[PDB]
Write a protein that binds this ligand. Structure first.
Ligand SMILES: Nc1ncnc2c1ncn2[C@@H]1O[C@H](COP(=O)(O)OP(=O)(O)NP(=O)(O)O)[C@@H](O)[C@H]1O
Ligand SMILES: Nc1ncnc2c1ncn2[C@@H]1O[C@H](COP(=O)(O)OP(=O)(O)NP(=O)(O)O)[C@@H](O)[C@H]1O
Ligand SMILES: Nc1ncnc2c1ncn2[C@@H]1O[C@H](COP(=O)(O)OP(=O)(O)O)[C@@H](O)[C@H]1O
Ligand SMILES: Oc1ccc(/C=C/c2cc(O)cc(O)c2)cc1
Ligand SMILES: [Mg+2]
Ligand SMILES: [Mg+2]
Ligand SMILES: [Mg+2]
Lengths: 495, 310, 310
């Protein structure tokens, strides 16, 4: 009598009952945990999401065509996790952490659960450190701090991704520097996009020498719904590695509209009844638990942080809709972009009234706060008065002044792409406007003036700019020096 | 009595008992977990099986895992020992300052005060906020609601109210963070340490904190409002005192209920909501009240989905 | 081996196999039919039964009818002898010109080119059309989409571009008619004969034709796009060459998937569509692409239901 083969018992393994649309229903697996990774005989992985009396509903991390009824499924013993660490920097990986850039295995030495709960109340401290985008309009009006979540939201082709790209590229001046604490490691999560678009993107980041401090997590349009669903949580864990180890990371989720669509798909196929707009009832929680994980840690937890810029695509400009407001109701503010603004020449196409930062000047250097502190409310009142004054007849001194200022500030917050600005340069430029030195300059000349002014202070007053950058403020001396530069230069400019 | 897990799908766990079935609302304790995992009984499904909502994550649960009936609903610490502390849904400290050494506990589920317990006294509570004071003033011991869509200023307003009214308040306050930002909870906490309404060194704290935020699964968010409310009820009744109750945000109780509703087997009502929306809100809201025994001035932030007040 | 039909509802046929269950995506041949009737495996239902999608009409089918597993997915002729020919969804000639005697066949299912296969070169393709060239220029080897509600000019535009870009093109072209007008296929065919881009006597035909129009049942309409695209892939890779791919109309693929999705047992998604709308679209669209190996300039007409771009 020979020994029986026990390799295939129904506690540690199972057999496929049915398989369709990326859902395997599995007999056995009596010892599996909820949210455990399992393995199919074909080498495919999957996640145990439904534990039922007579079956496990398994969600497949890949193509389901190799799965057949009766196939063997094995426990891994492990709650779904990803590789994590600095080894990921400069690499493009899939939602599971596998290299897809053709550059060989990631030699990562640590792993991390994708579903870890966001830190609670005690491990954190108030967001206080600037996360500079280098975009004047963001950094002045809707400033972002380290540990903050700030939403990028708007219709197709309004400039959402470009905000994120410019922000990543901007970090090179800190990352090439010698102040370790100012460095910011970047993570770009692509969800639902076409592969060739992600490739153009990393090509842009490479040419900008920004790949070297960026991880690209890609779950694109032909990747299975569970992969797209997981990608943000995978990237988040990769980001949490810096957060918990005294470093600072930035994560972009591009985009969460497409992720919520993949979650919808996956939930429907699991037979979980649809809710509003056919999304599951807990589509808020899908994103809430994700973004809560962007956080600023206190010194006892290392003082590190993770900052998040999730992206949401609206339809027909409606930021008030169900899904958009769900995500707005999570983040510490939103940058709302509109086509109308975009085509009128307001680029970046930020709607000031509808955008906010929920951290405010706490996230700004003192110098920026000095120039930008009241501008956001001021610009809101400006736009209102400009609409009310529309029928041009007798306007008092106060509103005419409000109008002249407003129209000129609007020109100053216009900005091109791919050259994010050093904070002190942003301050010098905004300064000329908020202090009124441009109030009699023709508004159409403002952009020509800024670029000439900037090249002048950069070449001629590197010491003034140095002092503002280093001091983090405009001293009485710096103020006196700036006034003398802009008044006399403008006069030259206007000759 | 011992039971066993027979199904897990998200926040909803089914548990079979061979002997005595735990009544609806009972807290069940999941065995073999690192941190306390409570399941609350929602329905008796028949065949000795109960349907429960979990108070924490269900990851790692295994079909067959043991569950003990505690014999009562979720019971939490109430009393002066809650002052200056942070508690979670199930009354565990989450401020890292050790045990909450109360003489007494209370179930988070209770009957609402009777009609004969009602008070009709109403006098102005001045806020120092022009638009509130002029057009729609608050009343001491009254029920105040702050409605707004995402990012219109509910939380800034409640914090201004805490700043203007609660800092110089003579009695106790409870703040219940319900399904909101953890960041905001850390902000408020350290702000209140700074102003001295929370004191980590003596017994002069005037505010109890109860938090279950949007990093939490729906069970925690659907019950954490009751935890906060139960704390305020003790102060109201077992001290007869003037209590301030701030809740941000009470919508998240209703939303949490909507997240589990399909898994609890309901046909949806309109706009994707549970059919029980109004009675659920009613049994909770009717406890948030001044009575003849004592006064609660309640201020509740009320989220407005898709900016639609309807 | 040999299976039996156990259920028929429109394009959805369930087939039971005693031994050897056919994998998903395999092509099954129904026995006892005058013309070839292919069923594509979509799901393993359990109990040795597979759920399939018919590639032609299912009238005349009887429960118990025999089905044979081909041992592979649908495979079509690819290469030079597709040029000047019209084929259907399963690669049969539909032009009355006899067999397509190719040496190569390829499966209509294939994984999309990997991330390393992508090209990053951006170069303008001048159309001669003012509004396009000025405001939203096309790119060589790029993906071009033409959005339009009923009757606003999708087909005219696609034909003008064939006239403007394709005329002066030193490569091969593929036109795939997907759920559109059969007589539009007849127009195009005879126009290309007249111009000589299709030659019925030479080997100098430069276009391959693939059609499954609005007379076809949903399974055929949901797959012909894969069929035409498969033809284009061969030219892109196995000649390395510059290919043009015209599709009128890609929306009809999604619409066709919508019609079988209920019959497949899926819970409907928004506006009654398949919950797999985006992933079905993704795994099809991501094959329509330029790679490092060769260029595909693709032009797709995209019907807009009820003029609603949302
Ligand atoms: N500041 C700017 N000035 C001028 N053009 C810009 C600016 N920012 C973005 N753009 C351009 O506007 C177009 C759309 O930008 P993009 O960042 O791709 O927006 P999006 O909303 O992410 N589009 P999609 O994701 O494709 O729906 C691109 O051509 C950008 O180069
Ligand atoms: N460029 C054009 N110049 C003049 N008339 C045009 C033009 N394009 C379309 N039309 C008119 O519109 C009709 C429909 O054009 P067509 O290109 O078939 O639109 P379509 O969007 O493909 N229709 P359908 O496929 O039924 O949704 C033509 O027969 C013309 O009468
Ligand atoms: N009273 C106010 N004064 C100035 N800014 C405000 C005020 N109230 C709100 N804001 C701006 O609006 C943002 C959102 O306010 P918040 O109270 O967080 O909204 P809600 O809680 O309703 O979502 C704030 O971070 C702030 O930037
Ligand atoms: O004329 C009409 C136009 C649109 C619709 C919408 C249907 C619909 C149904 C759902 O279950 C979810 C959803 O997001 C949309 C109905 C009628
Ligand atoms: Mg984008
Ligand atoms: Mg709030
Ligand atoms: Mg047409």
């Amino acid at each position: 009598i020979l020994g029986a083969d026990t390799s295939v018992d129904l506690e540690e393994t199972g057999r496929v009952l049915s398989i369709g649309d990326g859902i395997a229903r599995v007999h056995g697996l009596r010892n599996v945990q909820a949210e455990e990774m399992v393995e199919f005989s074909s080498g495919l992985k999957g996640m145990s999401l439904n534990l039922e009396p007579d079956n496990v509903g398994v969600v497949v991390f890949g193509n389901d065509k190799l799965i057949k009824e009766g196939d063997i499924v094995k426990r891994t013993g492990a709650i779904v996790d990803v590789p994590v660490g600095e080894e990921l920097l400069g690499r493009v990986v899939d939602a599971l952490g596998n290299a897809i850039d053709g550059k060989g295995p990631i030699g990562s030495k640590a792993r991390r659960r994708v579903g870890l709960k966001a830190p609670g109340i005690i491990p954190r401290i108030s967001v206080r450190e600037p996360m500079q985008t280098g975009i004047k309009a963001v950094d002045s009006l809707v400033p972002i701090g380290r540990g903050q979540r700030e939403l990028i939201i708007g219709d197709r082709q309004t400039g959402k991704t470009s905000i994120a790209i410019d922000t990543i590229i901007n970090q090179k001046r800190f990352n090439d520097g010698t102040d370790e604490k100012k460095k910011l490691y970047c993570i770009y999560v692509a969800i639902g996009q076409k592969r060739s678009t992600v490739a153009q993107l990393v090509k842009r980041l490479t040419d900008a020498d920004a790949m070297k401090y960026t991880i690209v997590v890609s779950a694109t349009a032909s990747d299975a719904a569970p992969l797209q669903y997981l990608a943000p949580y995978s990237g988040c864990s990769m980001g949490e590695y810096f957060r918990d180890n005294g470093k600072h990371a930035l994560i972009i989720y591009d985009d969460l509209s497409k992720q919520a669509v993949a979650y919808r798909q996956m939930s429907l196929l699991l037979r979980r009844p649809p809710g509003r707009e056919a999304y599951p009832g807990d589509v808020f929680y899908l994103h809430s638990r994700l973004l809560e994980r962007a956080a600023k840690m206190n010194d006892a937890f290392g003082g590190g942080s993770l900052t998040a810029l999730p992206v949401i695509e609206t339809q027909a400009g409606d930021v008030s809709a169900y899904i958009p407001t769900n995500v707005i109701s999570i983040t510490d503010g939103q940058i709302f972009l509109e086509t109308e603004l975009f085509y009128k020449g307001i680029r970046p196409a930020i709607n000031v009234g509808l955008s906010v930062s929920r951290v405010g000047s706490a996230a700004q250097t003192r110098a920026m706060k000095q120039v930008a502190g009241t501008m956001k409310l001021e610009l809101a009142q400006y736009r209102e008065v400009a609409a009310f004054a529309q029928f041009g007849s007798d306007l008092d001194a106060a509103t005419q002044q409000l109008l002249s200022r407003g129209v000129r500030l609007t020109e100053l917050l216009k900005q091109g792409q791919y050259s994010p600005m050093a904070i002190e340069e942003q301050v010098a430029v905004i300064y000329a406007g908020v202090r009124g030195y441009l109030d009699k300059l023709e508004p159409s000349k403002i952009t020509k003036f800024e670029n000439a002014f900037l090249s002048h202070v950069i070449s001629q007053h590197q010491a003034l700019l140095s002092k503002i950058r280093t001091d983090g403020k405009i001293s009485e001396e710096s103020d006196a020096k700036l006034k003398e530069i802009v008044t006399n230069f403008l006069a030259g400019f206007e000759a | 009595t011992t039971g066993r897990i027979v199904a897990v799908i998200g926040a909803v766990v089914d548990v079979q008992f061979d002997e005595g079935l735990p009544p609806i609302l009972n807290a069940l304790e999941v065995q073999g977990r690192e941190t306390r995992l409570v399941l609350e009984v929602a329905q008796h499904l028949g065949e000795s099986t109960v349907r429960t909502i979990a108070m924490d994550g269900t990851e790692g649960l295994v079909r067959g895992q043991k569950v003990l009936d505690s014999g009562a609903p979720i019971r939490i610490p109430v009393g002066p020992e809650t002052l200056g502390r942070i508690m979670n849904v199930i009354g565990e400290p989450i401020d890292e300052r050790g045990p909450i050494k109360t003489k007494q506990f209370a179930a988070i589920h209770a009957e609402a005060p009777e009609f004969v317990e009602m008070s009709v006294e109403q006098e102005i509570l001045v806020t120092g906020i022009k638009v509130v004071d002029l057009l729609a003033p608050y009343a001491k011991g009254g029920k105040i609601g702050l409605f707004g869509g995402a990012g219109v200023g509910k939380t800034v307003l409640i914090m201004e109210l805490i700043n203007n009214v609660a800092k110089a308040h003579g009695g106790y306050s409870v703040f219940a963070g319900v399904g909101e930002r953890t960041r905001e909870g850390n902000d408020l906490y350290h702000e209140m340490i700074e102003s001295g309404v929370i004191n980590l060194k003596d017994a002069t704290s005037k505010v109890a904190l109860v938090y279950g935020q949007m990093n939490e699964p729906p069970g925690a968010r659907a019950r954490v409002a009751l935890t906060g409310l139960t704390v305020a009820e003790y102060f109201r009744d077992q001290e007869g005192q003037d209590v301030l109750l701030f809740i941000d945000n009470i919508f998240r109780f209703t939303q949490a209920g909507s997240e589990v509703s399909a898994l609890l087997g309901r046909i949806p009502s309109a706009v994707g909501y549970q059919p029980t929306l109004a009675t659920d809100m009613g049994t909770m809201q009717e406890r948030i009240t001044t009575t003849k025994k004592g006064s609660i001035t309640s201020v509740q932030a009320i989220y407005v989905p898709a900016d639609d007040l309807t």
